[PDB]
Design a binder for this molecule. Structure first.
Ligand SMILES: C[C@@H]1O[C@]2(O[C@@H]3[C@@H](O)[C@H](O)O[C@H](CO)[C@H]3O[C@@]3(O[C@H]4[C@H](O2)[C@@H](O)[C@@H](O)O[C@@H]4CO)O[C@H](CO)[C@H](O)[C@H](O)[C@H]3O)[C@@H](O)[C@H](O)[C@@H]1O
Ligand SMILES: [Zn+2]
Ligand SMILES: [Zn+2]
Ligand SMILES: [Zn+2]
Ligand SMILES: [Zn+2]
Ligand SMILES: [Zn+2]
Length: 428
């Protein structure tokens, strides 16, 4: 049990005669680094060796490599709420849970985000951004085809048929071959793929209930030309954005900033709308986001300063303001000083980029509707491998996503059993 208390963390910042060097690895260097520099200016006794690890996929592989070698491990490492699990369960990350930290830091982060940085009773990071889903809609394309901004998956289907019949170079949306994109859709309609009871006890429901119904719907959308299967955040996707290939894009809301940065020519053409409802339920959402974690290898005499850094970067009021000023005036932060500020909720756009100026109100309503009835599996790295090998190849106009979900469940059951997890599946 970690004996680094909330007071010990604060002492690392006030005890300026105690110089520390911290190595910090991050994939989201573009959005984060100016605020890291602000930390260093404020606390010159804590020097930050900031390492941009490149693409997220390369970051996670690099970190696994150093952990297994037990050598050259960073003190602080960027994680995410749906990819940290396998690192936490394998002992790569410091579990810094204790009563003092829980009492103090729980007041600093919105409860949906604070729950998700726990796993198996341990506490593994400070939440960074929250990522409620938004539908980024090419309103110009919909207007041209006499189509309404869709509020439901039913509308996406019905209007999508009309769009693609009239203009076979455009699709209503993309079904993205990315584990976050795909699982976020299921979570946002209340369709559990699995349930976690303890670190060693899991239930897989990938071929039954609401999940199966939603898979059947996604497959019909692919077959009928409503959604196109393809990669996200690749050059193929980047070209499709500029080309207007997708009338809608339902995604984690950091993308709202990405469009402003990479697609200036789309100014005035998009609306930011709520993600869609399903079967006449009120709409729900999903939020994942990044987190900053401490490695299990971090030396004991560096741990208080490492924790002070992650808490400052992710919740200090000056840091939160820096996150806004250095990312086009908005970044959607989990800190309560952002989430509880009614002037963030009612913040108006002023750059003219989106056709609606109430973008943050849309993001905050979606955050309010996040489906919290959800856990990620202990082995999320293996989940992404199986998704890539088994599910992604069926994301096409003739695909059998239903059969692929059942085969992926079988592979995950075998992996769970081989690694000592108790597992049930809906095929048992
Ligand atoms: C790995 C990834 O981390 C989290 O998503 C990242 C966001 O938190 C961050 O703000 O923005 C990144 C993109 O610039 C996201 O990664 C992309 O990574 C996201 C992060 O997502 C965000 O927290 C934030 O840092 O922005 C980056 C993109 O600039 O996430 C997508 C999945 O949506 C995909 O993995 C890309 O390769 C990443 O670059 C989580 O929220 C994600 O679900 C995921 O775990
Ligand atoms: Zn707790
Ligand atoms: Zn058209
Ligand atoms: Zn077609
Ligand atoms: Zn390419
Ligand atoms: Zn401050």
């Amino acid at each position: 049990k970690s004996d680094v208390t909330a007071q010990d963390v604060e002492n690392a910042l006030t005890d300026t005669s105690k110089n520390v060097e911290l190595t910090v690895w991050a994939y989201s260097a573009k959005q984060m680094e100016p605020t890291v520099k602000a930390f260093e200016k404020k606390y010159p006794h804590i020097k930050i060796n900031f390492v941009n690890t490149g693409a997220a996929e390369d970051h996670f592989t690099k970190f696994q490599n150093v952990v297994q070698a037990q050598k050259d491990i960073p003190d602080v490492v960027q994680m995410s709420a749906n990819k940290f699990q396998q690192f936490a369960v394998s002992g790569a990350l410091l579990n810094f849970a204790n009563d003092s930290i829980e009492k103090a830091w729980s007041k600093l982060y919105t409860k949906t985000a604070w729950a998700q940085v726990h796993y198996a009773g341990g506490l593994y990071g400070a939440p960074q951004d929250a990522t409620p889903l938004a539908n980024y809609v090419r309103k110009d394309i919909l207007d041209e085809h006499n189509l309404q901004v869709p509020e439901s998956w039913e509308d996406i289907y019905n209007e999508g048929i009309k769009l693609h019949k009239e203009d076979s170079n455009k699709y209503m949306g993309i079904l993205g071959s990315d584990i976050s994109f795909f699982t976020n859709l299921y979570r946002s309609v209340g369709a559990r793929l699995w349930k976690v009871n303890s670190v060693d006890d899991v239930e897989l429901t990938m071929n039954s209930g609401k999940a199966k119904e939603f898979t059947e719907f996604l497959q019909k959308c692919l077959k009928d030309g409503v959604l196109e299967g393809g990669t996200v955040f690749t050059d193929e996707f980047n070209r499709s954005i500029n080309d207007g290939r997708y009338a809608t894009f339902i995604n984690e809301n950091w993308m709202g900033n990405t469009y402003k940065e990479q697609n200036p020519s789309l100014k005035g053409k998009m609306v930011v709308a709520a993600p869609p409802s399903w079967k006449g339920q009120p709409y729900q959402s999903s939020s994942v986001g990044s987190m900053m974690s401490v490695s299990a290898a971090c030396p004991k005499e560096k741990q208080a300063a490492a924790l002070a850094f992650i808490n400052w970067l992710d919740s200090d009021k000056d840091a939160i303001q820096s996150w806004q000023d250095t990312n086009n005036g908005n970044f959607f932060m989990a800190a309560s000083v952002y989430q509880d500020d009614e002037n963030q909720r009612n913040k108006k756009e002023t750059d003219g980029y989106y056709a609606n100026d109430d973008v943050n109100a849309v993001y905050f309503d979606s955050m309010d509707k996040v489906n919290t009835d959800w856990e990620y599996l202990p082995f999320m790295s293996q989940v992404e491998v199986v998704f890539n090998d088994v599910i992604v190849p069926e994301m096409n106009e003739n695909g059998d996503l239903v059969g692929a979900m059942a085969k992926a469940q079988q592979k995950l059951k075998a992996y769970a059993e081989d690694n000592g997890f108790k597992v049930t599946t809906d095929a048992d």
